[PDB]
Write an enzyme that holds these catalytic residues in place. Structure first.
Site, short mmCIF file in Angstrom:
data_model
loop_
_atom_site.label_atom_id
_atom_site.label_comp_id
_atom_site.label_asym_id
_atom_site.label_seq_id
_atom_site.Cartn_x
_atom_site.Cartn_y
_atom_site.Cartn_z
N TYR A 189 0.81 -1.24 0.00
CA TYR A 189 0.00 0.00 0.00
C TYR A 189 0.83 1.27 0.00
CZ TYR A 189 -4.43 -2.44 0.74
OH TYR A 189 -5.49 -3.30 0.56
N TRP A 220 0.85 -1.94 4.91
CA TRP A 220 -0.19 -2.95 4.68
C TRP A 220 0.42 -4.36 4.74
CZ3 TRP A 220 -1.18 -6.75 0.91
CH2 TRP A 220 -2.44 -7.36 1.03
CU CU Z 1 -6.51 -3.34 -1.25
#
Ligand code: CU
Ligand code: CU
Ligand code: CU
Length: 639
Positions: A272, A290
């Site tokens: 991310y 993430w």
């Molecule tokens: Cu996602």
């Protein structure tokens, strides 16, 4: 799973016709409401006629059709699974026009859908162009056609949605392949899910606007499940995809060879994160908790020439963290990064605090002030969008998003940020009166005329849930500091959706979902055709043509000379885009200063600053007096 956007039409009085039907597998077996009976084309018997095979339905009366579904045979046999296909509508049964949907369905026994904008029609035709495994047959257990609750003609002047491109995957990430003009898309280790990935594999798919063909490819050579990645187009014309499901990996996509090449592992495992191509063609990244762990993940930089990532530990992520209620897991995600002058990278948000990142030495970070205006300090805007619509003047439009990644109300906040030199605090003002509709998870692209097209999203961020969806896109017109609602579409585009500008000047908007058995996966995209491609008649306008270019590769500060088939009023370069999770750090627009040579010959200089004219591939568009853009000529910009 997936779902229709409409309600199933009663098939009581339907008449159906097929191009061929084996006895026992009659054409009407596809509308008998029994999942264990199916239509099947000739085999053995009358031989094995190859596709295309055709299913035509006469619904007897006019319906406001907005989709169909196709349930494949459910008997464990794969024969006749429809691969490539087209859907046509008709009011008379002989004039079919162009397909309202086309593309390729995944090779499996799950219900397939074609969802598309409402259109009154009495006849519906499904053409099975190929069988999913390349065999001669077509079979269908149940076919259904769906209807909207009402029809309203699109308003003249507000663009048009359509057609739908059907896909084998949920395109949660995407890029244009600039040398081929194709749209490249990918999901994860599966067409519809990322959870439970063993890593090492990515399902990809591509659509070719020129042939209408959707193909697919499983990528394992890079040992990378590329879900939830950073994406940048580097200065050597390669798409750098970083981390995500395999948090330390880099995969390189080379458009010229249409191949994926292993890249170096990043120094820090990330998911991310945003990455951004820099003025020297390198790629900077930061944050990304993430995946790969939750801790302070400071900057690092990729060199296409040495093929290394080098850590920049003093490019500190701390100052760009949002105050996300979920903490560092979300708060370092999806930075609004833009490569800028002298190797700098500007971070415009989502955090209230904006920052300059510097890539010399072991890196550095300098406060660029708070995103704000006379309306007050802008709050954190996670999954808000940011678009550099005039790189020459340093203009970035930011909009939407919410204070927390999820379970948070989105806003209509929008700002214009004006970049000067790195290390100076840019001016920021509110953009008009903000968005018409509060949205997060929306997507956006800068168009050839410098306007920004904004689409999809929902009012309250609830990943994988199609609630509070926004169906009306908006376009920001900078010369007017005004947003305009466009004609609405009918397909929710929320978490995991993408948009990209196509070389033909239209927008490709797709994806959403990627949640396995959820019904909110969207295995498709639609085309939005902006009003600038339509005449006052409502017909497609005549487009100026670039009949000649002096060169297809140019150094920053370099001149290009073109000839057109008609007088040109304006011209722009739009850097090719890449998209995932609301992030697109590759697109940007340069308005071009034209010298009129006479005789419809024009010249222009590419900006000398590579922080403005980021190296890589760009689309050259020319617009006539009527404001109609040519299709793009592809230009490679180098240092
Ligand atoms: Cu996602
Ligand atoms: Cu997001
Ligand atoms: Cu985000």
């Amino acid at each position: 799973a997936s779902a229709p956007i409409g309600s199933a039409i009663s098939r009581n009085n339907w008449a159906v016709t097929c191009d061929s039907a084996q006895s026992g597998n009659e054409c009407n077996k596809a509308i008998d409401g029994n999942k264990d009976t199916f239509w099947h084309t000739f085999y053995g018997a009358n031989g094995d006629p190859k596709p295309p095979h055709t299913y035509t339905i006469d619904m007897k009366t006019t319906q406001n059709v907005n989709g169909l579904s196709m349930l494949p045979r459910q008997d464990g046999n794969q024969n006749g699974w429809i691969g490539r296909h087209e859907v046509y509508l008709s009011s008379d049964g002989t004039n079919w026009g162009s397909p309202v949907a086309s593309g390729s369905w995944f090779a499996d026994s799950t219900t397939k859908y074609s969802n598309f904008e409402t259109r009154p029609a009495r006849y519906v035709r499904l053409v099975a162009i190929t069988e999913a495994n390349g065999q001669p047959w077509t079979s269908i257990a149940e076919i259904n056609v769906f209807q909207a609750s009402s029809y309203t003609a699109p308003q003249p002047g507000l663009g048009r949605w359509g057609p739908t491109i059907d896909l084998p995957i949920v395109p949660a990430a995407a890029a244009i392949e600039p040398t081929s003009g194709r749209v490249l898309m990918w999901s994860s280790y599966r067409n519809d899910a990322f959870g439970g990935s063993p890593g090492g594999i990515t399902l990809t798919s591509s659509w070719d606007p020129s042939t209408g063909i959707v193909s697919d490819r499983t990528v394992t050579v890079t040992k990378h499940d590329m879900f939830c990645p950073g994406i940048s187009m580097d200065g050597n014309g390669q798409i750098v995809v970083t981390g995500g499901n395999d948090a330390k990996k880099t995969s390189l996509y080379d458009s010229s060879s249409d191949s994926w090449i292993p890249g170096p592992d990043m120094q820090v495992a990330r998911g991310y994160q945003s990455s951004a191509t820099m003025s020297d063609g390198r790629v900077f990244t930061i944050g990304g908790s993430w995946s790969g762990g939750v801790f302070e993940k400071n900057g690092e930089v990729y060199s296409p020439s040495s093929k290394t990532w080098t850590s920049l530990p003093n490019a500190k992520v701390n100052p760009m963290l949002t105050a996300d209620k979920q903490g560092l897991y979300r708060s370092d995600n999806h930075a609004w990064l833009f490569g800028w002058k002298k190797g700098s990278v500007f971070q415009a948000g989502p955090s209230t605090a904006m920052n300059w990142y510097y890539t010399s030495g072991s890196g550095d970070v300098k406060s660029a002030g708070k995103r704000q205006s006379n309306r007050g300090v802008a709050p954190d805007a996670m999954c808000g969008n940011a678009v550099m619509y005039d790189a020459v003047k340093g203009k970035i439009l930011t909009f939407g998003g919410s204070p927390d990644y999820q379970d948070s109300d989105a806003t209509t906040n929008a700002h214009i940020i004006t970049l000067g030199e790195p290390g100076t605090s840019p001016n920021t003002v509110f953009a008009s009166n903000g968005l018409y509709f509060a949205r997060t998870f929306h997507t956006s692209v800068v168009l050839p005329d410098g306007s920004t097209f904004i689409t999809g999203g929902q009012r309250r961020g609830i990943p994988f849930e199609d609630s509070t969806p926004v169906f009306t896109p908006e376009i920001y017109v900078p010369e007017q500091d005004t947003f305009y609602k466009q004609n609405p579409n009918s397909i929710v585009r929320v978490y995991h959706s993408i948009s990209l500008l196509l070389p033909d000047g239209r927008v490709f908007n797709g994806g959403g979902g990627l949640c396995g058995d959820c019904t909110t996966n969207h295995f498709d995209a639609q085309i939005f055709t902006p009003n600038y491609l339509y005449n006052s008649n409502g017909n497609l306008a005549t487009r100026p043509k670039i009949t000649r270019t002096s060169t297809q590769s140019v150094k920053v500060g370099g001149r290009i000379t073109i000839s057109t088939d008609s007088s040109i009023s304006k011209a722009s370069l739009i850097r090719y885009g890449t998209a995932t999770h609301t992030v697109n750090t590759d697109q940007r627009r340069i308005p071009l200063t034209l010298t009129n040579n006479g005789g419809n010959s024009y010249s222009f200089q590419v900006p000398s600053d590579s922080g403005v004219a980021l190296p890589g591939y760009w689309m050259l568009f020319v617009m006539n007096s009527a404001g109609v853009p040519s299709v793009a000529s592809t230009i490679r910009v180098t240092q």
